[PDB]
Amino acid sequence: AEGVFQGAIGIDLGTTYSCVATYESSVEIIANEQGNRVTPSFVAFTPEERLIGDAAKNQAALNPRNTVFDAKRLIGRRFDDESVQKDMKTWPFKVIDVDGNPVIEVQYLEETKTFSPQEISAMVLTKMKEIAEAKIGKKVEKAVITVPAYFNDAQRQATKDAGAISGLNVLRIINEPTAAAIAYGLGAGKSEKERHVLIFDLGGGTFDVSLLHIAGGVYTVKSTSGNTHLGGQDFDTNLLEHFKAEFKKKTGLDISDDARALRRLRTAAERAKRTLSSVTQTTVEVDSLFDGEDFESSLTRARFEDLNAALFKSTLEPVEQVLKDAKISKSQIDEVVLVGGSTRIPKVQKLLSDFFDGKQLEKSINPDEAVAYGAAVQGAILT
Ligand SMILES: [Cl-]
Ligand SMILES: [Cl-]
Ligand SMILES: [Cl-]
Ligand SMILES: [Cl-]
Ligand SMILES: [Mg+2]
Ligand SMILES: [Mg+2]
């Protein structure tokens, strides 16, 4: 027990970003060595070393064949699965078929090596463990890891297996939406007074809606829906195209083939989106965007909303589906919990609060951190 943490860390092993939390005297989300409270679920292999997290994502463009990401899209799946065959056409790294399983093949230290999805995820989980250890000052042996509610038994086992590989005793695999509810203490009393709770989780690349029944300490997923491939980055993309159009119109320049110019302009758009969650108008500037020309525009909240009209509206569909499927009316819903950074967008909150006739949404916990937070809460209950 000497020099070992007696608790269990909570890990949100996300598709694109991961987050780790612990609950000593209170629940804390842990920052990594670059001071970030989420860490890219990225592993890069180079002629000299392996990078995990921020450094891996930051060199992805320079090292695309050997920078691995989206392993959560493979884990516990089969090579000839339909999502897989499809996902593979979109990745710059090689995925091969070994005994019918997907396996990632890369160059590492000037040799060809292959990794299962569980092995890649284990490397991310090891990174999360190490991040937690650095802040705790102790070794971590126990964890609670979260997975999407639609994960099947193979996907769940493969995720536990990843944990084992990373030197963690995985006490429980819990559902992402359930973690978020636990974060808000919903059902914490373990009282027999029941609740129905809708989790609205709009991630950067994922949109998941889940209906929970909670009573007596038992969290039951009644129904689940979403858009796997719609997310916050899609809002950025619409603003990016709007800005590209403006720039080309004023200057005659097309930045489509300049990766750096595209990157800087998407950064401007991401920043502009965030500003517009707090205020209603902003300038948008990029100095010397292309061929000597400065980019300057402005954007109102109203215009931002119009540019994403259809997308925003589409977010109510899965809320309706989940109720329809569970045979539960919107009036029976006790809490609506917001997860994912994109839920900070005022319009998204408004469409949702209006659908529930002015109901206030649970949002006091950072939406990017809520899943990890509840995983940490569950970890403390188990230890
Ligand atoms: Cl995810
Ligand atoms: Cl993610
Ligand atoms: Cl630059
Ligand atoms: Cl700039
Ligand atoms: Mg998430
Ligand atoms: Mg300037």
XYZ file of C-alpha atoms and ligand atoms in Angstrom:
389
model
C 0.000 0.000 0.000
C 3.068 2.258 0.494
C 3.178 4.970 -2.137
C -0.091 3.678 -3.720
C -3.293 5.667 -4.142
C -6.090 3.876 -2.313
C -8.701 5.276 -4.688
C -9.719 4.623 -8.237
C -9.214 7.281 -10.850
C -12.046 8.090 -13.256
C -11.238 7.973 -16.988
C -13.272 9.240 -19.863
C -11.575 7.417 -22.776
C -12.996 9.556 -25.554
C -12.824 9.044 -29.255
C -10.861 12.249 -29.851
C -10.111 13.470 -26.324
C -9.620 11.806 -22.989
C -10.049 13.241 -19.444
C -9.011 11.899 -15.979
C -10.370 12.916 -12.557
C -9.910 11.797 -8.957
C -11.957 12.274 -5.763
C -9.698 12.724 -2.699
C -11.384 15.332 -0.491
C -13.179 16.658 -3.585
C -13.499 15.865 -7.271
C -10.643 17.283 -9.356
C -9.974 17.013 -13.074
C -6.259 16.513 -13.661
C -4.174 18.604 -16.089
C -1.433 17.012 -18.184
C 2.166 18.143 -18.566
C 1.160 20.840 -21.142
C -1.424 22.147 -18.635
C -4.418 20.778 -20.499
C -7.441 19.244 -18.702
C -8.240 16.990 -21.717
C -5.624 15.013 -23.698
C -5.885 13.916 -27.324
C -6.538 10.204 -27.708
C -3.614 10.102 -30.083
C -0.509 7.888 -30.348
C 2.355 8.745 -32.660
C 5.286 6.521 -33.603
C 8.511 8.028 -35.011
C 11.971 6.801 -36.034
C 13.065 7.691 -32.463
C 10.185 7.523 -29.998
C 6.486 7.227 -29.201
C 4.356 10.233 -28.291
C 1.011 10.156 -26.573
C -1.556 12.914 -26.308
C -0.874 16.534 -27.165
C 2.543 16.048 -28.779
C 1.112 13.202 -30.887
C -1.708 15.350 -32.215
C 0.557 18.306 -32.760
C 2.857 16.382 -35.214
C 0.019 14.430 -36.928
C 0.212 16.578 -40.029
C 3.972 15.964 -40.257
C 3.669 12.186 -39.663
C 0.260 11.077 -40.878
C 0.985 7.400 -41.711
C 2.270 6.686 -38.170
C -0.015 8.860 -36.076
C -2.913 6.750 -34.800
C -6.237 8.157 -33.623
C -9.922 7.092 -33.493
C -9.062 3.632 -32.037
C -12.382 3.828 -30.155
C -13.997 3.341 -33.600
C -12.241 -0.053 -33.906
C -12.141 -1.383 -30.390
C -14.096 -4.641 -29.972
C -15.049 -4.626 -33.683
C -14.356 -6.943 -36.652
C -12.377 -6.041 -39.767
C -15.275 -6.686 -42.150
C -17.729 -4.647 -40.002
C -19.507 -1.980 -41.995
C -18.594 1.022 -39.816
C -14.958 -0.186 -39.912
C -14.589 -0.759 -43.637
C -16.054 2.692 -44.010
C -13.957 4.410 -41.298
C -10.744 2.999 -42.812
C -11.142 4.938 -46.050
C -10.957 8.147 -43.964
C -7.724 7.395 -42.059
C -4.228 8.068 -43.223
C -2.772 5.226 -41.142
C -2.919 1.544 -42.273
C -5.451 -0.908 -40.826
C -5.100 -4.539 -41.781
C -7.097 -7.686 -41.253
C -5.622 -10.215 -38.824
C -7.822 -13.261 -38.094
C -10.786 -11.020 -39.006
C -9.844 -8.300 -36.521
C -8.721 -4.786 -37.384
C -5.062 -4.178 -36.560
C -3.117 -0.950 -36.994
C 0.216 -1.179 -38.841
C 2.855 1.551 -38.537
C 6.504 2.348 -38.745
C 8.137 2.733 -35.353
C 11.899 2.979 -34.772
C 12.328 2.137 -38.481
C 10.478 -1.182 -38.151
C 6.983 -2.258 -39.090
C 4.890 -2.995 -36.011
C 1.234 -3.773 -35.534
C -1.145 -2.964 -32.653
C -4.643 -3.941 -31.775
C -7.095 -1.174 -30.975
C -6.981 -2.316 -27.337
C -3.153 -1.901 -27.401
C -3.466 1.628 -28.753
C -6.165 2.541 -26.217
C -4.008 0.986 -23.428
C -1.219 3.483 -24.422
C -3.693 6.377 -24.060
C -4.941 4.926 -20.762
C -1.339 4.631 -19.547
C -0.857 8.285 -20.383
C -4.024 9.171 -18.354
C -2.791 7.077 -15.496
C 0.576 8.854 -15.541
C -1.047 12.272 -15.689
C -3.051 11.351 -12.560
C 0.021 9.899 -10.796
C 2.006 13.158 -11.307
C -0.657 15.179 -9.550
C -1.458 12.601 -6.875
C 2.183 11.901 -5.931
C 1.315 8.201 -5.703
C 1.037 5.153 -7.970
C -2.465 4.412 -9.343
C -3.655 0.839 -9.544
C -7.480 1.152 -9.786
C -9.784 2.877 -12.282
C -13.354 3.351 -13.458
C -13.501 3.767 -17.263
C -16.473 5.025 -19.208
C -17.857 3.853 -22.565
C -20.790 4.948 -24.734
C -24.145 3.463 -23.706
C -24.521 1.760 -27.115
C -21.334 -0.231 -26.604
C -21.949 -3.984 -26.803
C -20.288 -6.752 -24.750
C -17.244 -7.164 -27.056
C -16.629 -3.353 -27.079
C -16.887 -3.302 -23.262
C -14.567 -6.241 -22.740
C -12.011 -4.857 -25.209
C -12.043 -1.596 -23.210
C -11.463 -3.464 -19.900
C -8.729 -5.420 -21.630
C -7.085 -2.134 -22.632
C -7.148 -1.168 -18.960
C -5.516 -4.404 -17.852
C -2.769 -3.869 -20.474
C -2.128 -0.395 -19.020
C -1.590 -1.819 -15.512
C -5.031 -0.770 -14.208
C -7.441 -2.867 -12.117
C -10.642 -1.724 -13.903
C -13.252 -1.866 -11.110
C -16.149 -1.027 -13.444
C -16.950 -0.039 -16.928
C -19.738 2.518 -16.668
C -21.868 4.195 -19.322
C -20.868 7.729 -20.350
C -24.383 9.137 -19.766
C -24.633 7.385 -16.422
C -21.281 8.949 -15.348
C -22.590 12.419 -16.225
C -25.709 11.807 -14.030
C -23.499 10.573 -11.167
C -21.392 13.695 -11.579
C -24.532 15.742 -10.744
C -25.355 13.472 -7.812
C -28.632 12.330 -9.357
C -29.611 9.145 -7.499
C -26.824 9.647 -4.941
C -29.232 9.252 -1.998
C -29.994 5.775 -3.318
C -33.570 6.667 -2.435
C -36.535 4.843 -3.872
C -38.003 8.085 -5.210
C -37.398 7.606 -8.950
C -36.160 9.996 -11.616
C -35.932 10.114 -15.431
C -32.962 12.019 -16.759
C -32.064 12.944 -20.308
C -28.342 13.236 -21.177
C -27.661 15.514 -24.170
C -24.045 14.941 -25.166
C -22.834 16.961 -28.164
C -19.079 16.284 -28.490
C -16.602 17.616 -31.030
C -17.218 14.630 -33.310
C -20.087 12.752 -31.674
C -23.697 13.435 -30.639
C -25.289 11.050 -28.132
C -28.680 11.307 -26.428
C -29.643 8.869 -23.666
C -32.650 8.451 -21.367
C -31.917 7.121 -17.884
C -34.269 5.757 -15.269
C -32.710 6.025 -11.807
C -34.114 4.544 -8.603
C -32.681 2.993 -5.473
C -29.111 3.308 -6.692
C -29.746 1.602 -10.088
C -29.108 3.594 -13.313
C -31.027 2.036 -16.238
C -30.519 3.217 -19.810
C -34.042 3.160 -21.250
C -33.190 4.389 -24.713
C -30.371 5.848 -26.704
C -29.959 7.819 -29.963
C -27.742 10.194 -31.836
C -25.562 11.099 -34.748
C -22.224 9.237 -34.398
C -20.504 11.500 -36.933
C -22.156 14.950 -36.147
C -20.480 17.212 -33.570
C -19.078 20.591 -32.531
C -16.351 20.622 -35.192
C -19.221 20.742 -37.768
C -20.213 24.148 -36.471
C -16.633 25.330 -36.931
C -16.589 23.935 -40.464
C -19.603 26.025 -41.539
C -18.005 29.186 -40.160
C -14.676 28.284 -41.858
C -16.362 28.005 -45.283
C -18.171 31.298 -44.732
C -14.807 32.958 -43.975
C -13.027 31.306 -46.861
C -15.777 32.606 -49.183
C -15.480 36.137 -47.833
C -11.738 36.155 -48.153
C -11.757 34.855 -51.710
C -14.410 37.390 -52.626
C -12.453 40.402 -51.306
C -8.942 39.294 -52.378
C -9.279 36.705 -55.197
C -7.252 34.262 -53.069
C -8.272 30.591 -52.434
C -6.481 29.175 -49.395
C -7.835 25.644 -49.993
C -4.438 24.108 -50.744
C -2.471 25.880 -47.926
C -2.774 23.716 -44.850
C -1.311 26.434 -42.595
C -3.738 29.144 -43.830
C -6.658 26.687 -43.369
C -5.447 25.830 -39.883
C -5.138 29.484 -38.816
C -8.545 30.347 -40.233
C -10.233 27.365 -38.536
C -8.586 28.494 -35.314
C -10.086 31.966 -35.834
C -13.510 30.359 -36.379
C -13.294 28.167 -33.313
C -12.362 31.266 -31.276
C -15.166 33.254 -32.860
C -17.701 30.568 -32.003
C -16.571 30.568 -28.368
C -16.667 34.350 -28.085
C -20.239 34.269 -29.415
C -21.322 31.980 -26.584
C -20.560 34.882 -24.227
C -21.202 37.977 -26.314
C -23.231 38.813 -29.406
C -20.701 40.246 -31.814
C -16.933 39.903 -32.563
C -14.319 40.891 -35.131
C -12.498 37.896 -36.647
C -8.897 38.507 -37.723
C -5.978 36.572 -39.103
C -2.839 38.558 -39.710
C -1.165 37.851 -43.056
C -3.482 34.961 -43.845
C -2.316 34.359 -47.397
C -0.067 36.074 -50.004
C 0.469 39.006 -47.689
C -3.267 39.667 -47.183
C -4.784 40.124 -43.729
C -8.098 38.533 -43.024
C -10.677 40.706 -41.235
C -14.409 40.139 -40.826
C -17.092 40.308 -38.216
C -19.721 37.999 -37.025
C -22.860 38.325 -34.922
C -24.447 35.580 -32.779
C -27.454 35.829 -35.099
C -25.360 35.253 -38.188
C -23.497 32.366 -36.472
C -26.869 30.802 -35.730
C -28.173 31.252 -39.263
C -25.000 29.676 -40.660
C -25.737 26.582 -38.603
C -29.576 26.699 -38.775
C -30.216 23.137 -40.002
C -27.597 21.499 -37.799
C -28.837 23.097 -34.626
C -32.429 22.207 -35.349
C -31.406 18.630 -36.131
C -30.205 18.197 -32.533
C -33.871 17.889 -31.271
C -34.490 14.803 -33.417
C -32.727 12.310 -31.159
C -34.298 13.797 -28.047
C -37.714 13.088 -29.630
C -36.611 9.616 -30.713
C -35.374 8.617 -27.245
C -38.706 9.670 -25.605
C -40.686 8.028 -28.395
C -38.651 4.813 -28.068
C -38.796 4.743 -24.222
C -42.555 5.580 -24.249
C -41.848 8.449 -21.859
C -43.254 11.941 -22.364
C -41.146 15.072 -22.099
C -43.130 16.096 -18.936
C -41.826 12.983 -17.055
C -38.179 14.168 -17.562
C -36.658 15.363 -14.292
C -33.185 16.602 -15.316
C -31.611 17.485 -18.612
C -27.817 17.231 -18.374
C -25.552 18.914 -20.901
C -22.295 17.162 -21.952
C -19.777 18.318 -24.564
C -18.347 21.772 -25.233
C -20.860 22.548 -27.965
C -23.688 22.546 -25.396
C -22.374 25.966 -24.315
C -23.770 27.458 -27.517
C -26.749 29.678 -26.407
C -28.985 28.568 -29.289
C -28.460 24.931 -28.434
C -29.463 25.581 -24.855
C -32.428 27.622 -25.987
C -33.796 25.020 -28.490
C -33.497 22.419 -25.770
C -34.930 24.476 -22.893
C -37.883 25.521 -25.201
C -38.525 21.882 -26.118
C -38.895 21.151 -22.371
C -41.120 24.193 -21.946
C -38.541 26.405 -20.256
C -36.913 23.738 -18.096
C -33.470 24.776 -16.768
C -30.599 22.535 -17.927
C -27.899 20.982 -15.684
C -24.728 22.612 -16.832
C -22.782 23.798 -13.836
C -20.046 21.133 -14.365
C -17.744 21.822 -17.301
C -19.416 19.881 -20.110
C -16.055 18.456 -21.330
C -15.200 17.201 -17.865
C -18.548 15.868 -16.574
C -18.044 12.269 -17.704
C -14.610 12.003 -16.038
C -16.061 13.737 -12.971
C -18.774 11.114 -12.556
C -16.291 8.312 -13.210
C -14.178 9.719 -10.304
C -17.332 9.849 -8.108
C -18.032 6.241 -8.966
C -14.438 5.372 -8.230
C -14.705 6.838 -4.709
C -17.935 4.826 -4.111
C -16.069 1.644 -5.022
C -13.064 2.238 -2.847
Cl -16.558 9.636 -27.481
Cl -14.088 12.837 -27.814
Cl 1.812 31.804 -39.659
Cl -3.322 36.390 -36.287
Mg -17.628 12.565 -24.386
Mg -2.938 42.357 -37.661
